[PDB]
Amino acid sequence: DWSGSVPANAENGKSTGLILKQGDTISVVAHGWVKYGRDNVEWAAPDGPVPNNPQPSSIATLVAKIANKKFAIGNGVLHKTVPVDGELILLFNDVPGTFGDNSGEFQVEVIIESRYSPLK
């Protein structure tokens, strides 16, 4: 449903144009490598920093923003139920005000697996 790049230096994240509703289900996979600083060690996968330089929880990981709330994605998720309405924004969750020294981008694929419709 959407594929593209999520830049590590985009403090506001990357809009996908996918408008999610409560009860939809989605899958995401994320590839590649970014820098969250200039030092040779400051590399991250979507799952987060390489663990020879750990950061606080969820910091410098790939997250989804929906309705301005962050949800864990990391390297990916399969068939997860969306709990709030909103456009899916993808974000490298680095410390605000420090994105300017970042580089690289993740290659991300999103599939809307289902649109909410209950048995009735």
Swiss-Prot record:
Gene Ontology terms for molecular function: carbohydrate binding; metal ion binding
UniProt KW keywords: Calcium, Lectin, Metal-binding
Sites where the protein binds an alpha-D-galactoside: E42, Q55, D94, D101
Residues annotated to bind Ca(2+): Y36, D94, T98, D101, N102
Biotechnology: Can be used as a fluorescent probe for the specific detection and visualization of the alpha-Gal epitope present on porcine tissues. This epitope is mainly responsible for hyperacute rejection of porcine organ transplants in humans during xenotransplantation.
Assembly and oligomerization: Homotetramer.
Stated family: Belongs to the LecA/PllA lectin family.
Function: Lectin that specifically binds alpha-galactoside-terminating glycoconjugates. Shows high apparent binding to the alpha-Gal epitope (Gal-alpha-1,3-Gal-beta-1,4-GlcNAc terminating glycans) as well as to Gal-alpha-1,4-GlcNAc and Gal-alpha-1,3-GalNAc. Gal-alpha-1,3-GalNAc may be one natural ligand bound by PllA both in the nematode symbiont and in infected insects.
Protein's UniProt name: Lectin A
Organism of derivation: Photorhabdus laumondii subsp. laumondii (strain DSM 15139 / CIP 105565 / TT01) (Photorhabdus luminescens subsp. laumondii)
Lineage of source species: Bacteria, Pseudomonadati, Pseudomonadota, Gammaproteobacteria, Enterobacterales
Name of encoding gene: pllA
